[PDB]
Amino acid sequence: GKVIAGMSKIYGGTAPGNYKYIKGTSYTYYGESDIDRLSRWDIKEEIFSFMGILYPKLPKTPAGVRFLDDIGNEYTAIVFKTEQVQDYILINTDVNDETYQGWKGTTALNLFPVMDFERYRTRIIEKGQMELINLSKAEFKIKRKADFV
Amino acid sequence: TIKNFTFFSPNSTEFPVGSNNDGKLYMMLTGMDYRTIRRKDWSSPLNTALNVQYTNTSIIAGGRYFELLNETVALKGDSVNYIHANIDLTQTANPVSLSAETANNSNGVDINNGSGVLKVCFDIVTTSGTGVTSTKPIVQTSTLDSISVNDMTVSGSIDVPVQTLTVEAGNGLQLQLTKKNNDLVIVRFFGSVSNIQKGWNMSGTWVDRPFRPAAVQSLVGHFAGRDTSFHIDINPNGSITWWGANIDKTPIATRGNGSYFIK
Amino acid sequence: TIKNFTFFSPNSTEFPVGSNNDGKLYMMLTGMDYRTIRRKDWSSPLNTALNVQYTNTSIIAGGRYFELLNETVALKGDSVNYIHANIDLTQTANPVSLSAETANNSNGVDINNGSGVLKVCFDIVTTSGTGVTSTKPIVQTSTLDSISVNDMTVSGSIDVPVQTLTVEAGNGLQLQLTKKNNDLVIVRFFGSVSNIQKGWNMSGTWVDRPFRPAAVQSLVGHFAGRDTSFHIDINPNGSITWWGANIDKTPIATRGNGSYFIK
Amino acid sequence: TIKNFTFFSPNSTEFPVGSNNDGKLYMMLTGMDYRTIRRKDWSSPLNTALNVQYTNTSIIAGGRYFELLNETVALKGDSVNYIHANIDLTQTANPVSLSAETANNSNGVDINNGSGVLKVCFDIVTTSGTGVTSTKPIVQTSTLDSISVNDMTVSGSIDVPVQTLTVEAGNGLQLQLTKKNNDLVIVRFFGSVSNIQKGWNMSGTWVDRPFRPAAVQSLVGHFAGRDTSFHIDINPNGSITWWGANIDKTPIATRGNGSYFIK
Numbered sequence: 001g002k003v004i005a006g007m008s009k010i011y012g013g014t015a016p017g018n019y020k021y022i023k024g025t026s027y028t029y030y031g032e033s034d035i036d037r038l039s040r041w042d043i044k045e046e047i048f049s050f051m052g053i054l055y056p057k058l059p060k061t062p063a064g065v066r067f068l069d070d071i072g073n074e075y076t077a078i079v080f081k082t083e084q085v086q087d088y089i090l091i092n093t094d095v096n097d098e099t100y101q102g103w104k105g106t107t108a109l110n111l112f113p114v115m116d117f118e119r120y121r122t123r124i125i126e127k128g129q130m131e132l133i134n135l136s137k138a139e140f141k142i143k144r145k146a147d148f149v
Numbered sequence: 150t151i152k153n154f155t156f157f158s159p160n161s162t163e164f165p166v167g168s169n170n171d172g173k174l175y176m177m178l179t180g181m182d183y184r185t186i187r188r189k190d191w192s193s194p195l196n197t198a199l200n201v202q203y204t205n206t207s208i209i210a211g212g213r214y215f216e217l218l219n220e221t222v223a224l225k226g227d228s229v230n231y232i233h234a235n236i237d238l239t240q241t242a243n244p245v246s247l248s249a250e251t252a253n254n255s256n257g258v259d260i261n262n263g264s265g266v267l268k269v270c271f272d273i274v275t276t277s278g279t280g281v282t283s284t285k286p287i288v289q290t291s292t293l294d295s296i297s298v299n300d301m302t303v304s305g306s307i308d309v310p311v312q313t314l315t316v317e318a319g320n321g322l323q324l325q326l327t328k329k330n331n332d333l334v335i336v337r338f339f340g341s342v343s344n345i346q347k348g349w350n351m352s353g354t355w356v357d358r359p360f361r362p363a364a365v366q367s368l369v370g371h372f373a374g375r376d377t378s379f380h381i382d383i384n385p386n387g388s389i390t391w392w393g394a395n396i397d398k399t400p401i402a403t404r405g406n407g408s409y410f411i412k
Numbered sequence: 413t414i415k416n417f418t419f420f421s422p423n424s425t426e427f428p429v430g431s432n433n434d435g436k437l438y439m440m441l442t443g444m445d446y447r448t449i450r451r452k453d454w455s456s457p458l459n460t461a462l463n464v465q466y467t468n469t470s471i472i473a474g475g476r477y478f479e480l481l482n483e484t485v486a487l488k489g490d491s492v493n494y495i496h497a498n499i500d501l502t503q504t505a506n507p508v509s510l511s512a513e514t515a516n517n518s519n520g521v522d523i524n525n526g527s528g529v530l531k532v533c534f535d536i537v538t539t540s541g542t543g544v545t546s547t548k549p550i551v552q553t554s555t556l557d558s559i560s561v562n563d564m565t566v567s568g569s570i571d572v573p574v575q576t577l578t579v580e581a582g583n584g585l586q587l588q589l590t591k592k593n594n595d596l597v598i599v600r601f602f603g604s605v606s607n608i609q610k611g612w613n614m615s616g617t618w619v620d621r622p623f624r625p626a627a628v629q630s631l632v633g634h635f636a637g638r639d640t641s642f643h644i645d646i647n648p649n650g651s652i653t654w655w656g657a658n659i660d661k662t663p664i665a666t667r668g669n670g671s672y673f674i675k
Numbered sequence: 676t677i678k679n680f681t682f683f684s685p686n687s688t689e690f691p692v693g694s695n696n697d698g699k700l701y702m703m704l705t706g707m708d709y710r711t712i713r714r715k716d717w718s719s720p721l722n723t724a725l726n727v728q729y730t731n732t733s734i735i736a737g738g739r740y741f742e743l744l745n746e747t748v749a750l751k752g753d754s755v756n757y758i759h760a761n762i763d764l765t766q767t768a769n770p771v772s773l774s775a776e777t778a779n780n781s782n783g784v785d786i787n788n789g790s791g792v793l794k795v796c797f798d799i800v801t802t803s804g805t806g807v808t809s810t811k812p813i814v815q816t817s818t819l820d821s822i823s824v825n826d827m828t829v830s831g832s833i834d835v836p837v838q839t840l841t842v843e844a845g846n847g848l849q850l851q852l853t854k855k856n857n858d859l860v861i862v863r864f865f866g867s868v869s870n871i872q873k874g875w876n877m878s879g880t881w882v883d884r885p886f887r888p889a890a891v892q893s894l895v896g897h898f899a900g901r902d903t904s905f906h907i908d909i910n911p912n913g914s915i916t917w918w919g920a921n922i923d924k925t926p927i928a929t930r931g932n933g934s935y936f937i938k
Contacts, residue, residue, distance in 0.1 A: 001420055001421055001422050001423065001424055002424065003161075003162060003165050004424050005161045006687065007424050008165060008424065009165075009166045009171070010158045010161055010162075010163070010164065010165055010166065011155075011156065011157045011158055011164065011693055011694040011697075012157075012158045012159075012160075012161030012162075012163075013161060015157055015159075016157045016693045016694050016695050016764070017156070017157035017158060017693045017694045018691030018692060018693050019691070019692055020684045020687055020688070020689075020690065020691050020692070021429075021430065021431040021434075021681065021682065021683050021684065021690065021692075022683065022684060022685075022687055023430070023683060023685070024428055025428065025687075026428045026429055026430060027428070027429055028420075028421035028424050028425065028426070028427055028428050028429070029166065029167050029168040029171065029418070029419070029420050029421065029427070030165045030166075030167060030420065030424075031165075031167050031168075031420045032167040032168055032169040032170070032238075032261075032420055033152060033167050033169055033170050033742065034262075037262075037263055037264050038238055038239055038264050039239075039264060040239035042239075068266060070246075071233065071235050071246065071248040071250070071268070072235050072237065072256070072258075072265075072266030072267070072268045073250075073254060073268070129237075129239070129266070131264075131265070150743075150744045150745060150746055151741060151742070151743060151744075151746055151769070151771050151772075151773075152741060152742040152743075152744055153739075153741045153769075153770055153771055154739075154740045154741060154742070155694055155697060155698055155701070155735075155738065155739040155740040155741075156694050156739060156741075156764075156770050156771075157693070157694050157764075157767065159767050163767070163768075167420065168418050168419050168420045170740070170742070171418060172418055173715075173717075173733050173742075174701075174733070174735065174740045175418070175437070175441060176715075177705075177713045177714075177715055177733065177735055178441050178442075178701060178704050178705040178713065178735070179440075179441040179442075179443075179704075179705075180705075180817075187440045187441065188440075189436075189439075189440055191436075191522065191525050192525075205525060207436050207437070207440060209437065209440055209441070212418065213417075213418040213419065214417040214418045214433070214436075214437045214440075215414060215415060215416050215417055215418070216414070216415040216417070216433070216436075217414055217415075218413050218414075218415055219413060220413055220414050238419075241420070241422050241426075242426075243414070243416070244416055244419050245414050245416055245419075246414070247414070259717065262717045262718075262731060288557055288558045288825075288826075289556070289557035289558060290557075290558050290560060291443075291556050291557070291558060291559045291560070292560050292561075293559060293560070293561040293562075293815070293817050294561070294562055294814050294815035294816070294817070295561070295562060295563050295564070295565075295814045295815060295816045295817060296561055296563070296564040296565065296817050296819065296822075297564075297565050297816060297817065297818040297819070298564065298565070298566055298567075298568075298819045298820075298821070298822055299566070299567045299568045299819075299820055299821060300551075300566075300568040300569060300570075300571075300820075300821045300822075301566065301568075301569075301570040301571065301821070301822045301823075301824065302571045302821075302822070302823045302824070303570065303571065303572045303573065303593075303824055303825075303826075303827065304573065304824070304825050305573070305824075305825045305826040306572075306573070306593055306594050306595070306826060306827075307570075307572065307593055307826075307827040307828075307829065307833075308826075308827065308828040308829060309829050309832075309833065310829065310830065310831070310832070311675075327673055329595075329673070330829070330832055330833055331832050332832075332855075333596075333859075335671055335672060335673055337629070337630065338630065347899075347900035348900065366863070366932055367863065367864065367897070367930035367931050367932055368931075368932055369632055369895060369896065369897045369904070369931045369932065370632065371630070371632045371641055371642070371643040371655070372902075373610070373643070373655045374610035374611065374655060374656075374657065375610075375656075375657055376635075376640035376641060376642065376656060376657040377640075377641070377902035377903075378632065378641040378897055378902060378903075378904040379897070379902065380897035380899065380930055380931055382930070392897075392899045392900060392930065393897075393900075393901070393902060394900075394901060394902035404630035404643055404645070404655060405630050405631075405632045405643055406629060406630055406631055406632070406670055406671060406672055407932055408671045408861060408932060408934045409861060409932055410853055410855070410861055412837070431681045431682050431683055434681055435681055438681070438700070438704060441704050441705075442703070442704040442705075450703040450704065451703075452699070452702075452703055454699075454785065454788045455788075468788060470699050470700070470703060472700065472703055472704070475681065476679075476680075476681040476682065477680045477681045477692075477696070477699075477700045477703075478677060478678060478679050478680055478681075479677070479678040479680070479696070479699075480677060480678075481676050481677075481678055482676060483676060483677055501682075504683070504685060504689075505689070506677070506679075507679055507682050508677050508679055509677070510677070551820050551821050552819070552820035552821065553820070553821050553823060554706075554819050554820070554821065554822050554823070555823045556822060556823070556824045556825075557824070557825050557826075558824070558825060558826050558827070558828075559822075559824055559826070559827045559828065560828045560830075561827070561828070561829060561830075562814075562829075562830050562831040563814075563829075563831035563832055563833075563834070564829065564832075564833045564834065565834045566833065566834060566835050566836065566856070567836065568836075569835075569836075569856055569857050569858075570833070570835065570856055574938070590936055592858075592936070596859075598934060598935065598936055600892070600893060601893065632895055633895065634893070634895045634904055634905065634906040634918075634919075636873075636906070636918050637873035637874065637918060637919070637920065638919070638920055639898075639903035639904060639905070639919060639920040640903075640904070641895070641904040667893035667895075667906055667908075667918065668893050668894070668895040668906055669892060669893055669894055669895065669933055669934060669935055671934045
């Protein structure tokens, strides 16, 4: 948020600065140092399957996605611990043709046995947010059901 | 790069202080981490059925101050509910949300420096089928480096560094030392002493350097099932000097407790 | 309803912080209630006749910070003057005033949540008929829940919990146990022992659970007016075993101090 | 004059709060002086040869908050460097600057009230010819008046006030008393007692008032080189009453340790 004289917490004007306690206008914090760290993959309605293209950061460190509910608790997580940095991990949660494959160059590797089976509790994603574990970039395509249209 | 905050801004644009910057500041002042809170009930919370209403309760979680004004939270029947303060900075309209949970799901997420949702338990509500039975609040941890205090009042207990050592003095003597706060030591006598004279040193092992006192401590003991006693001299160099009656080949059981100061 | 204070305002209007909200925030950090203060004399106050001039003193009362810069308080002669900081928020232009009173009239009024004048004593100034004879500051109380600290320097005294127990051990033996910090116990022997044998359990009351040690403790005692001694074992189950010589019908006085650790 | 700060300005001019005014407040809340700091490493500082880069370290020096974000400090080859935080308020653009010095040059200059540059050490860096060997941070002192706490955990040591006394009880008996925290006293027996009967008060000096107990303390001692024992009753009036066997003209060496509580 923008910095305003009298409204924001700053020691301005006459030395050695001054911030006044008013009623309603008083002092409101401008923002946060390094606000670029905050990112939210918002989930507003219940989704049933997805096709994510995950680009990993560090090798040998579990890389993938984790899902949190409305109270900040993890319910499921698709995460993989590979030996080398994959160019991308192509994941499809579709039941009919489930795919968990890693790509390096022109070579396709099945990443299913390397995956953490304990964290992946459900496929059904609930209302909340999604976090990126050891990922530099991610591209998601979400498919959500409607009974009558 | 140095980011200054509690300083004068000439053109009223110089040192803008953010909520995370003040958040980090407030944490360091009280001495708290992302796993503990600062909670105060200005007015006692009301319990109606399987619900708990916080009439007026202020909470400082992760250095962020917020007030609960008549905020009611639903509870689970016949269960131990762990009330959590949930902070999500991405939810710019309403960052703080409350939740009654099955277990203490405190994460300790660094919201001020990094991303994520911070969860921290502050109250433990025990319920029945109808309403609330008992309420126990979470402890407020004050992590500090050094204290220069005049007076102190403790309602519970103080945990001091405890060190234990078992020295086989010799001639049939065993000493069980228990050093607390690196000062007070209570020595327990064990075994059965045989073949020793008055004023003579002990044949076996010597007392280790951390358990050695500043001056020669005369520790009194007793012979089990008798009306005769003894005393040993633990010299500052670690040596143990016998000062009881002369003991012949027959071994007599030695028991007793003797306390001394190191400093 | 939840009120959010230490959070960013996207349109610079969402989260305004009031003086009472910061007052409550500052109290919770330092661990102060409405019956104490935070006080610092940056420069020494000056006494002139029956007056005290606070040259440069900072005070925090009810989480509210204010400075006393060349502020003189008139005193009563040949009296003990209790100097109070009085906060009345309805007095918009001058909310703080100082008074010299005949008694400590601290009222603990919650000025951040409700109405009323907060009165808090911070100094005690004793006078003669002509001027100040002595000054004593009021103690600054830091109320905390739990402390994890490396080292501490105490100039006064630490008050730890104390529990006492009198045990009629049997055979005429009496133990008076004093436990401090729920750990260190000093046993004082009383009474007179008769009709007991070595290795035999004493015929009376066992030691109560809060005084029972983790391991067997041998405590040396002495027979009054004699050159003879005994010892007893306080077993972890609470039972007491006699380890002196066998005693006949005639009672012998038992005295002495013995120490042990419960933990 | 009274300068009010945590209050309202209805005309938006009445009570303005500056950097020094808040700086003084923060110091009082945490209990720090101009010689100590509040430091927290959110991410460990990197060491590249004779240089130290502070990735993310927040510091509160003289009540003034600042963050070090990837700030590198130049180091001296094969020397014990002292990293100082230098605050010069005259430098409106850059008040805080860092320096690695030969010795600890903490000045403790009052910047919030008076003029000057505040220098304070926070980290000690031991280096070799190539790079950093070891790092030790300066202790964060928390000066407090009184603490009302529930539970405490000490990793180092508590320094309680110690008092020594050497009272010549008489008849040839010497006592070495050591009182810590005005409660626990360990009496050390010395000398050689002669010409005394059972239940008779000892001829020499009486126990001083700060060492006198609340009740009569029975303390057991031992005769060096023998299997005979004794006990002395230290009554609340300071009088030492002998309670061993009747001793003639020949003096026998008395040694032993006895613990008792005053309170």
